Design an enzyme around this catalytic site. Structure first.
Site, mmCIF file in Angstrom:
data_model
loop_
_atom_site.group_PDB
_atom_site.id
_atom_site.type_symbol
_atom_site.label_atom_id
_atom_site.label_comp_id
_atom_site.label_asym_id
_atom_site.label_seq_id
_atom_site.Cartn_x
_atom_site.Cartn_y
_atom_site.Cartn_z
ATOM 1 N N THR C 88 0.847 -1.208 0.000
ATOM 2 C CA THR C 88 0.000 0.000 0.000
ATOM 3 C C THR C 88 0.881 1.256 0.000
ATOM 4 O O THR C 88 0.625 2.185 -0.762
ATOM 5 C CB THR C 88 -0.947 0.042 1.214
ATOM 6 O OG1 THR C 88 -1.812 -1.100 1.189
ATOM 7 C CG2 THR C 88 -1.786 1.310 1.194
ATOM 8 N N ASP C 358 2.827 -11.385 5.052
ATOM 9 C CA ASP C 358 3.671 -10.182 5.018
ATOM 10 C C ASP C 358 4.834 -10.238 6.004
ATOM 11 O O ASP C 358 5.981 -10.049 5.621
ATOM 12 C CB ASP C 358 2.825 -8.938 5.296
ATOM 13 C CG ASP C 358 1.936 -8.510 4.138
ATOM 14 O OD1 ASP C 358 2.096 -9.039 3.063
ATOM 15 O OD2 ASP C 358 1.003 -7.778 4.369
#
Lengths: 491, 491, 491, 491
Positions: C88, C358
Site C-alpha cells: 500500500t 507479510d
C-alpha cells in the site's frame, strides 16, 4: 412479371443509364494514362495495399456492379492477356466512344446508325495503324529497350526505367529461344524490398522464395543434381521414411525441391546425406525448375531415377534483406529466368513488378509482330485526323457516328496532357496541326517536356500490337454494346 | 456502381482527406523524437501494457484504418528491419512531407510537379547525407558505444544508457565474428524485473526461461554435453520410454533441451542418469543453443549420437528474482549471446528491452557501413539549408516542391526541441544559422542542455544508414503517395 | 482512423485524465496504511468473502480498467514479490507523486522537467534510506520479531501479533538453513477456525489438509517411511492393482501421499498392509514433503524403491475443529515448515494468514539485507525534510518537481495519522520539527498513542528493503508514467 | 474505472449502508430467541417446506446478497459447528453491536475508536462468562438434561422436551465412550411422522431407512453377521454373479448392506441362501454400521472374509407408519446410535429433529467443558452491568464504544421478553436491578411465567461454551467488520 426494386429504362433512357456506367470507368482510369500518368492505391479483401498504374489491375480488383461497366473490364483483360500494356488506353477509349455515342443518341440518331459508323471508323482505324506501322528488328536490343522504357513510364517505377528495360529485354530474349514466340510465363517476377531499383537483377535460372528445411543442411551446392518431387516426403516409421531419403541419394540427387511437405525426420536424414531440401514448393515453380535445369517432376519416389535429375551449376541459399531465398543458377540451357526486384519499399517494388509485367510483355509482342508505332498519343492523333476526313467521304448519317468515333480517340492525347499538368486544349491544337503538316513520325505529345515533339525521333514508341489490340477491344466492345438495347439480370 | 456508405472525393478533396490521414500519424509519433523525446503506453489485445518509445512498435500495435496512414507503418517497418532506430524519424518526415505537399496542392500546383520536385530533393538529400558522412572504425568500441547510447536516449531506459551501450556493443562484436555482417537474431533480449538496470548483464552463451523438469535432477552441470531433441519424449510403456532416456545417456549427453514435451516418467529416469532436462523449449532457442554450443538439433532420438552433442563449460539453473532460468555459458565458440535485463519494474525493463533492441541494431549498421553522421537533428538542418538553395537553382514549379521538401525536413529539429521543452522557433533560427557559419559537424540541437551545440564534438552521433534509410523510406513513400489520386478498397 | 466511442485527450487533458486514474487507486488503498491502518472486504468471482489489509491483495483482486491505474497494481506486485509488506505504501506514494505531478503540469511545467526532477529526488531518496539505515543482526531474534510485529499491525490480526511474530521468525530461521537466502515458498500458511489466534502453532514438518482414504487404515504411524507417488493408483483388475500396493509395502513404505487418485480397491489393500494413504495431494505439497522428509517424488510405481522413501518421526491424522488433517512432523532435517493458524472465525484467520504472509516475508528480507530503518512514517519524514533542501540546491525548473516529490512522500505520515483518528496537519508539523531537531531515530508517528515519538526506541522498525523497494517501485513508476503522453489501446 | 450500476459510498455512508445489511439479519432472526421464542417457515429450491427455529438453518438456507449480512451467516455457522445451539444469539448480538456502532459513527466517533472499545468490552465479556461459570459434572445426567431441555425450548418441539432430553443425553453418553470428546456425527437423527413425540426412541445400534430388496428374503436375523460391501453386486452372467453371492455366504454373512446397487439376480440367490440384503445404502450409514457392529467396509467381494463381518444381536425389518426400515440393534460395543423421532406430522418431527440437533450438541459441549452458565439472558445481563462500569473505568473515547457494546448485549433479555409477549422495557429494569442486588445465579428472564426469576434455581442453564462462542463469534465479527471501510466485489 418484373421484380419491384429492379430498375428498367427504355429507348434513350436505357442507353443513357447503361452507357454512363461504362463512361464512369473511363473517367476513373484515364488518370493513369501517359508516360507522365498517375497511380492508384488499391486495397484487397485481406487488407493488403497495392500501388499500381496497371489499368487491368485496377479494373480486375475494384468492385464494379453494372454489366456495361464490367465490359470495359473485359476490354482491359484482353489487352492484358494479349499485350500487357495499354490496358487503360483500351478502356478509356471504349468509355469515351460510349460517351460520344450517347451524345449522338441524344441528338436522335437511330441506334442502327451509331453501330454502323463506329464499325466503319474502327475497321479503318485498324488499317491506319497497320499503314503507319514501321518495321523494326524483332530481336533488336535498342527498339526493344525503347518499348520497355515507354511501357514503364507513367508508373512509380519510371525513376529507374533504364535499368529495368535492360533486364526485361534480356529476360525475353533468354527464354524465347527461336524467333519466335514469347510466353510471359517463363519469366518470373520476384520482389524484395531493400536497396534501390538499380539493384534489381536478372538470374539466369530459377529463384524461389524457399529456405533450407534443416539447419544441418549444406547452404551451397556446386554442380547441382536437382530432383523434383511432388509426393510429400512423409512416411510412418523411420525405416520406410529413410528409404525415401536413401533413394533420392541413390539417384545421385543433391538438391531436392518438394512440391508438398517434408517430414522433420526426412529433413534430418537428408542433411546427413548432404542433400539440400525445400518443402511446400509452388507447383508452378516446380515446372520452372523442370524447364530451367531440365529436371523431371516425378510423382512416386520409387520412380525417381538419375535420368530424372536436372543440372544447375550453382544451387545456393542467399539472404536478401534478411529473408533467405534459393537461387538455382548457371543451368545448361534454361527456358525460364527470374528477375529479383529491389527498391526502397515493398509498395515501390510492387509498382516496379507491375511496370516490368507490362514491359516484358510488350517487348515480346514486337518480337512476334515486327511492326512498331510511335507513342505519346501520336497514333490516336493520326486516327482522328484521317477518320474526320473519312466521315466527310462517307456522308449520310454514318458521318456523325464516325465523327464521334474519331473525336473520342482524342481522349488519349487529351488526358496525356491533362494529368501531365499540360493544357489539353492548347496541346491538342498544336499536335494535331503538327501531325498534318510534319507527318506521322513527326508529332504526338511529349508529356516529359509538356509540348508537341517527334515521338519516333525521341524513342517514344510502342508495339503495333499495343495500339491495334487497344482499338480492336475498345472499338469492338463499343460497337457491340451499341447493339444492346435491353439488360436482363437473373435474380 | 459504388456502395452507398463509402466516401469518395476527387481532385484536391481526394488528396486533402487521404494525405491528412498520414499527417495524423506523424503528429502522434512526433512526441517520441529526440534524445529527450517522450514515451507512449500501448495496451495489446490481451490486456498487457507496454511502455515504449519505438516508433515502429507504436505503429505496428496501434489500429490504423486508412491506407495512407498505413503507409507510414510500412515506412516504420523498413526502418526497423534495416536499421532498428529512427523509425519515428522516418514516419514523421513522411507525414510532414505529406503535410507540406497538401499545402502545395492547395496553392494549385499540379500533382505532376509535387512528385517531380520531391523526387529531386530526396535524391539530393541522399547524396548530402553521404557527402557529410564521416568514416569511422567499423568495430571501434568508442564510436559504437556513442551510437548505442544516443540510440537509447529519448526512452525511459536512458537513465542507464552507459551500462547498456557497453554490453550491446560487446553483444554485436561477439556474434558478428568477421568484419562483417551483423544479424540481430543471434543476440537475445531477456528481461526480468528486480535490482536496477546497472545489474543488466551479457551472458556468453544462451539463456533460456526454462526450468529443470524434475526436482531430483542436478541443478548444475560442468563440462556439459548438450543434446537438442525436437521429438517429444513421450512413449507408451515404461520399457520403450526408458529406452529413449537410455539412448540420450548412451550418446554421453548430460544436458537435454527438448523442443516439445517430456513425459513425467522420462523426467524421473533422466534424473536417475544424472541428466538435466527442460521441456517446451522454444524452437528459436533450440537454434540459439545449436549455434552457441555447436549442438545438433536432431529429430529421431534413434538418430541422436555423441557427434550430435554440443559443448558448454557450464549449464546451470539459477533463480533471478525467484524465477528459475537456465544459463548455458562458457561455450567454446558461441555464435549467439543473451543479455539478461534487470530493472526496478517489468514495464521499465520492457522499455530497456526496446532501447537495446534499437541500440544493438544501429551498432551493427555502422560495422556494416563504416560511415556515421552527427545526430540531434544536425543532418536534417544540413539538408534544409542546401535543399533551399537547390530549390532556387532548379526554379520553375519544382522549386516550390523542393522548398516544401526542405522545410518539412525541419520537423526533426522542430520537435527535438518542442518535446524537450525548448522553444522550437528560437532554437531552429540559432541552429540553422550556426550550421551555415560553423559547418556540418558544428551544429544541431543539444536537447540535453536545450541549446545549439556541436553534436559530433559531444558524441551525439547516429549511423549513416539510420538517416539514409529514414530519408529513403520517408521521401520515397511521399513521392510514391503523391502519384496516387484514387483509393479503391475491396468489400 | 480512430473508433468513435473511444476517448482521446491531448496535452494537459491527456495527463489530467490518465494521472487521475492512478490517484483514485491511492485514495482507495491509503485507508490501510499504518500500524493503526484499516481493513477492506473483497468478494471474489465465486462469492467468497475475504477480509484483508494487504495492498497487493486489494489491487490484484479488484477490477481496475485504466492502464495507469493498472500500473499501481504492478507497483504493488513487485513490492509483494520482493518484500511482502509495504504494498500500500508503494502504491499510495506512486499515486500521490502522480497527484502532485498533475498539479505541477497544471502550473505549466513542461513534462520534460517533471520527469527529470522526480528522477533526481527518487535517486536521492534511495541514498537517504541507505544513509540512515541501521545495521542489525541478520538472524537476531529481537529485531526480527519487531519487524514481524510491526508488519502484522494495521491488520485485524494485530490483537495477537506477539504470538505470531515468534512462530514467523522461527519459521524463517527453520527453513533458511545458512545465512542466507530466504524463500517464502518453504513456509506454508494453513488456517482453520476454532480457538483463538494464540493457539496458532508452528509444525516442524509438513501439514496437509488431507485425510486417511480408508476407515480401516492406521490413524498414526511412528518412525514413518514416506513415499511420494504422482501416478494415480488405479489399475483395471485386482491382481494388477494389488501389485502396485504390494510394491509400496515391498519398498518398506508405511505412509503414502499420492498426488493423483487412489482406487477404492487399493485403499482397501493398503489398509491390510498397515499403509496409511492420502489421495489428491497438492503437487506443491508433494514437493514440501520431499524437502521435509527427504522423500523422493516418483512417477512409476515400478520405480519406487526403499531409497525413494523419506523419514518422519511421526505421521498422524488429527482433527482440528472436527476437520481431519495429516501432520508429518519430527523430520530429521526438514527444509519446509507449516504454520497452522487458529482464530475465532474463518474470516479472522484469513486476515491472520495475510498478516503472517507479510510478516514472514519481511523477516526474511532483513536476514538477506542486514539493514533496517525506523517505521511509523519516520523515513518518509527524513526524505521530505532533506529533499526540500535538495530542491533548493538544485534550483531552476527541477526544484518544483523535487518539491512535489518530497511533499508527496508525506502521504504516509499524513494517512498514518488520518486513519488512526489523529489530526494529520498538527501531527505532521510536530513530527517534521521533531525529526529536524531530535534526529533520525528520534521521530515518526506513533499511531498507537497518536503522537510523535521515537520509532526506533519503541521498536517500530521495518527492513530497509521495505522502504527502498517502496520508493524504487513507487518513484520509478511515476517517473516512467511522466514520460508517457499517449495511451493507445487495441480493440 | 468503476462499473456504472454498482453503488459506492464513502465515510459514514459506506458504514451506514454496509452495517445496516447486518442489522437487517438480526432484526429477522431475533424472533426465534428465547425458551418462548418463535419459529420460521423456510421453503427450499425444490419446494420442500421446513419448520425450524435454528438460527444457522435460517441463515444458511435463506438468500442473503450483501457481504456484511453474509458475515452474520458465518457467525451462525461457527456457532453451529462448535456449539449447535445459540446460533441466533450470536447473530443478533453481532447485528445489534453493528447497530449501536453505526449510531456511534453517526455521533462522529472515529472508526479507530469503535474498533478498540469493542475489542476491550469483548475481551472482558469472555472473562466475565468464565468468571461466573459454575463447575458441573461432565457426565451428570441432571445438569445434562437441563441443558438438553433448555436447548429444545423456543421450538415447536418444546411440548415434549422432557422425553427428548432423556434420549439425547443418553445418546451422547452412549457414543462418547471416555470422558471425553463428543462427536455429533455418531448420533443419527431419523424422523418419521406418526404417533406423538413421546413415542420417539433411542436405538442402541444403527437404524437405516432401507428395505429388504427381495420379498423372499428373511425379515428378521438373530445373532446377525453383517457384511459391508461398497462394490455394486452386479455381474454379467449368472455363474459370475452367483459367485459373489456364494462368497458372502462363504464368509458366514447373513446380513448384507451394499453401498451401491444389487442386481435382481443377486437378490434372488441371496434369498435362497437366507441372506438379507439392502441396496443403495448411504456411504455415511456404511460407516455407522462399521462403528456400531464392528463390520468392515470392503471394496472387492473377493476380499470379503469372515474377519470382515460385524456382529449385532438383532437385524430386523420393521414398519413404522407403513414405511419399512432396518434396525441393526443389540451390537456388542456400538460407537454409533440412532434416534427415531415420532410426532403428529412430518413438519413437526422436522422441528423436533432440529431441537434434538441443537440439544445433543450442547449436551456434548458441557461434557467437554465442565463449566455451565445460567440462561434466560442472565449472562448478557451480567455482561451489560459490569461492562457499563468498565466503560466508566476506561474513559476517553473508548467508553462510548464499550457503552454501545454493553447496551447491545441487552438485545437477548430485550427480545426474550418481546417475543414472549412480555414488556421488554419493564422486565429489563426489574431483571437488571435484580441481578445487581441478588447476584449472578439470582436473575435473568423467566419467559415461561414472564417475569424476573432465578434461572439457575429453576434449571434454566446453558453450557459455558454456548455463551462464550456466541460472544466470541458475535463480538469478533463486529470488531472485525468495524475495521472494514471498503467493499470491493468482483464481476
Amino acid at each position: 412479371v418484373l421484380p419491384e426494386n429492379m430498375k428498367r429504362y427504355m429507348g434513350r433512357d436505357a442507353q443513357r443509364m447503361n452507357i454512363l456506367a461504362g463512361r464512369i470507368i473511363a473517367e476513373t482510369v484515364r488518370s493513369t494514362l501517359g508516360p507522365k500518368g498517375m497511380d492508384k492505391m488499391l486495397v484487397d479483401d485481406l487488407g493488403d495495399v497495392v500501388v499500381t498504374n496497371d489499368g487491368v489491375t485496377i479494373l480486375r480488383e475494384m468492385s464494379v456492379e453494372h454489366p456495361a461497366a464490367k465490359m470495359l473490364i473485359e476490354v482491359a483483360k484482353t489487352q492484358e492477356k494479349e499485350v500487357g500494356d495499354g490496358t487503360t488506353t483500351a478502356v478509356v477509349v471504349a468509355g469515351e466512344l460510349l460517351r460520344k455515342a450517347e451524345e449522338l443518341l441524344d441528338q436522335n440518331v437511330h441506334p442502327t446508325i451509331v453501330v454502323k459508323g463506329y464499325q466503319a471508323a474502327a475497321q479503318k482505324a485498324q488499317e491506319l495503324l497497320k499503314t503507319i506501322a514501321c518495321e523494326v528488328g524483332a530481336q533488336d536490343k535498342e527498339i526493344l529497350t525503347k518499348i520497355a522504357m515507354t511501357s514503364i513510364t507513367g508508373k512509380g517505377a519510371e525513376k529507374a526505367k533504364e535499368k529495368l528495360a535492360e533486364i526485361i529485354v534480356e529476360a525475353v530474349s533468354a527464354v524465347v529461344d527461336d524467333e519466335g514466340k514469347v510466353d510471359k510465363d517463363l519469366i518470373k517476377i520476384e520482389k524484395k524490398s531493400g536497396a534501390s531499383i538499380d539493384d534489381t537483377e536478372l538470374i539466369k535460372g530459377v529463384l524461389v522464395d524457399k529456405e533450407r528445411v534443416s539447419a544441418q543442411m549444406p547452404k551451397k551446392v556446386t554442380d547441382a543434381k536437382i530432383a523434383l518431387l511432388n509426393c510429400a516426403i512423409e512416411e510412418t516409421a523411420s525405416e520406410m521414411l529413410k528409404d525415401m531419403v536413401a533413394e533420392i541419394k541413390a539417384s545421385g540427387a543433391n538438391v531436392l525441391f518438394c512440391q508438398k511437405g517434408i517430414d522433420d525426420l526426412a529433413q534430418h536424414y537428408l542433411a546427413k546425406e548432404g542433400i539440400v531440401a525445400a518443402r511446400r514448393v509452388k507447383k508452378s515453380d516446380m515446372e520452372k525448375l523442370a524447364k530451367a535445369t531440365g529436371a523431371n517432376v516425378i510423382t512416386n519416389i520409387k520412380d525417381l531415377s538419375a535420368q530424372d535429375l536436372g543440372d544447375a551449376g550453382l544451387v545456393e541459399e542467399r539472404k536478401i534483406s534478411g529473408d533467405s531465398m534459393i537461387f538455382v543458377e548457371e543451368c545448361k540451357h534454361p527456358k525460364a529466368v527470374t528477375m529479383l526486384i529491389r527498391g526502397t519499399t515493398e509498395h515501390v517494388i510492387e509498382e516496379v513488378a507491375r511496370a516490368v509485367d507490362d514491359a516484358v510483355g510488350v517487348v515480346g509482342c514486337t518480337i512476334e509482330d515486327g511492326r512498331i508505332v510511335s507513342g505519346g498519343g501520336s497514333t490516336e492523333v493520326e486516327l482522328s485526323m484521317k477518320l474526320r476526313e473519312y466521315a466527310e467521304g462517307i456522308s449520310g448519317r454514318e458521318q456523325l457516328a464516325v465523327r464521334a468515333f474519331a473525336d473520342a480517340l482524342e481522349v488519349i492525347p487529351r488526358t496525356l496532357a491533362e494529368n501531365a499538368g499540360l493544357d489539353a486544349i492548347e496541346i491538342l491544337v498544336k499536335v494535331r496541326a503538327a501531325h498534318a503538316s510534319n507527318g506521322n513520325k513527326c508529332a504526338g505529345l511529349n508529356v516529359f517536356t509538356g509540348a508537341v515533339e517527334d515521338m519516333c525521333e525521341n524513342g517514344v514508341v510502342e508495339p503495333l500490337r499495343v495500339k491495334t489490340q487497344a482499338i480492336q477491344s475498345a472499338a469492338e466492345s463499343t460497337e457491340m454494346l451499341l447493339r444492346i438495347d435491353d439488360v436482363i439480370a437473373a435474380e
